[PDB]
Amino acid sequence: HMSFETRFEKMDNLLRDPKSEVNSDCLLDGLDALVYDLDFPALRKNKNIDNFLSRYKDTINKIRDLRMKAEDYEVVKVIGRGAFGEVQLVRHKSTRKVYAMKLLSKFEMIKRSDSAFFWEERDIMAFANSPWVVQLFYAFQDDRYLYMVMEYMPGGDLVNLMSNYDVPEKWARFYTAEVVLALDAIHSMGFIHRDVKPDNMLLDKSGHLKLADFGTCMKMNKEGMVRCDPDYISPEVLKYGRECDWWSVGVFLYEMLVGDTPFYVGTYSKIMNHKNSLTFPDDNDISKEAKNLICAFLTDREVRLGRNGVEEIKRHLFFKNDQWAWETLRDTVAPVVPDLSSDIDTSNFDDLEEDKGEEETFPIPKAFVGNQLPFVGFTYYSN
Template identity: 30%
Template sequence: MSLEQILYDPVNLKVFKSFCVQERSVENLLFWLETADYRTAEAPEYRRHVAKKIFRKYCAEGTKMEIAVKAATRKKVSPALLTDLPSLTLFDELRSEVMLSMKMDIFPRFVESDGYDALVELKFEQRKVVDMDEFDLYHFLGAGGFGMVLLAQKKDTGRFYAMKVMDKRILLSQNQTHSIFREKEVLACVEHPFVVALRYGFQTEDHLCLVLDFIEGGNMYTDLMRGPYTHERAMFYAAEIVLAMQHLHELDILYRDLKPDNVLLTLNGNCRLADMGAARGVSDDGTIRGGEQATASAPCTAKPVDLSKGRRMSITGTHGYRAPEVYERNYGKPADWWTVGILIIEMLTGDNPLRGSNRKESEHLAKHMDLTNALPSSMQASSRSCSLALLNRDATQRLGCGANGPAEIKEHPFFKPIDWEQLMAQEMAVPFEPDLDYEPTKRENIPTGTSQIDYFCTKVDYMQTSMSMRSTWPLNASDQAVFRSFDFVSNKVFEEELTEAYRREHPAESKDTKADEMCRLLQIL
């Protein structure tokens, strides 16, 4: 196998990564992976962010991260190239030199290793990056339309994840395979500081599994039960949601279900947009195109439509949060900005004035309620103004939907204290005292001889029913073929493990980095 065959195949890459860690030679592979991700960063805002991050880490004067490139080549990547929208080929010359270095140094040693021999001898059915046996399932977190969410720990790293487990029979019987492929494809395409990240997608004989970062602070809905947020806290969370929503829209993805339940909170004061189950592409059939980030399952995300009937989208989302045009079944990105307006109100008041007792009442409120008089006087003028501008019933006049797009929202006085570049880089000081706690969960006591996954399936009625159907409806080859392209692994998994290995070998540099971050925060303050 060539080095290219190693780097572009996740199974091969996993073994090569482990060898690099063992040989204490991780910098070149880490750079190659991070710049490979950069080359697929089609969303402009995120691309600028990643380019600056890579530049500071590998190219800036005085950087401590050593990669095998000539000084002259490194200097070609200047800060001036980062001011506008940087080219996707910005780091290609550096990548070529790093690739050559790996071919001359670490790769020949890898070829002589036992790991390489074992890799060559792997049979096709053994070529998996991850499977259920590599996880300990700890705790039941919740259930959804097609499955459940479990707290899972990866055995080799000790890292905790949220594992979304969906039943294949339920998806097939309800003709909803396109929806789960949409969710997986959106998560695979979207890597962003304020969106919950997908790390693995794999399957068992009976289930599909999405493995996502676990966010310890829980969801905003539960947190708001303690009372509404301060102006500063609501503004900060809203700003992060604006960046997340802008990223999805730049990838031509509609989120369609923003509400406090789908916003997860970190212990250090940030938030993450979660649950892409309602997301779809902007095209008539909802395809998630993904561009350079698309995976093999992208064609499975389309839902058959009869274009002769015109554009007729589903009424998706949660009543009380839907924009007026959603009820007319013809909507787009402006509908997502409407939900940001509601979220701001709910964060500041603890209440959603547009949520009726049923769908019909919520529709009437969305279309006719006098919002100006519905907002309490306790809201500051800037938050009232921003919310009302986002809740303009004319989608063409809604804040964020004009010629300047999301820049209109960012320039609103409500967000005046926000430094958007520092926020994106997660270098902006949190303007409130984080007060969330997390107590590690003990692993549930699973009876000896019982399958981990089956034990948790008994906690969800419809999954238990599906279990009982295994003998009468064994999934045949054609059933399984529907899910052939589901498996996925993010490069970020390997990058995180390489970064941790580097920090173990260079503890002094890690301390310097933390000190530098503290200095930046002090400057901001």
């Protein structure tokens, strides 16, 4: 019950607003997903399909050439692998710009009945629009792969850092602070990251931190929590709010200083008995400032620090230094500034093998399968 004028306006907004699922980029996916999942000699016996396909065939064949495609990016190297795909250092052929491009096998996702996990990662990386989060520039689908073009982080994760250095407190103070800010940014959007691991934490050219690889992420409820049923699991989740995340930071900090996980398959029982299993090494030259903070995080959900707000954490004297203050944090010098020669230098990154594998495909169907249907709305362009 509105006026034609105002109705017609709001339709144009829904087709422009990049957050909308009826974005004009989202709609082309829906058409392409039809042509992919209908162009089969078996299904093309049906007349309606035969004609629809014929009509749009010459069109969509032109559209595929013009929209962003895998052939636009030449593969430099594989900077990481995981479950359901890999990540590649890429260079745009035309613009001559380096990016990090994450692939996701459509077959494997469908094979194991697991599709709706990337959505939350996409939402965050694109719209977060902060200096603590690895930004997504372009995203595009394919016959058999999802692509995510995002900025190259040439400093590598912290896993390799910690392994190649004896981390002093001065460094732990910094890398903790940059996490604490990053994680608050995500909370401000209304999402709760889970299993915040050193694996996620990447380093930019300057040596500063940005988070990425946002799996096990869900949207906060109307209360500000999540109703859902490994060592980064809090008693909260094991028996889920924002407290969940602060636990995995207390773990993180303990790892940098002690050089092992806090709670060492029965490990779940040590997490529950958090009161009578908080042990430190014999020569704990770890300052009392750190031991204080780590214990403040690693405790029962009720009393766990951060329940009132993030500002509690910043007050802690563990952060109170001379070099930087929270607002000037990302502007200061970093503990480890990666010195790289070329703009394609993957020295901090591990050297993994190239694909060297025959790609598996779906069997050609006899009826409408709709394997491409769950991926509709994924594509995104950043102007």
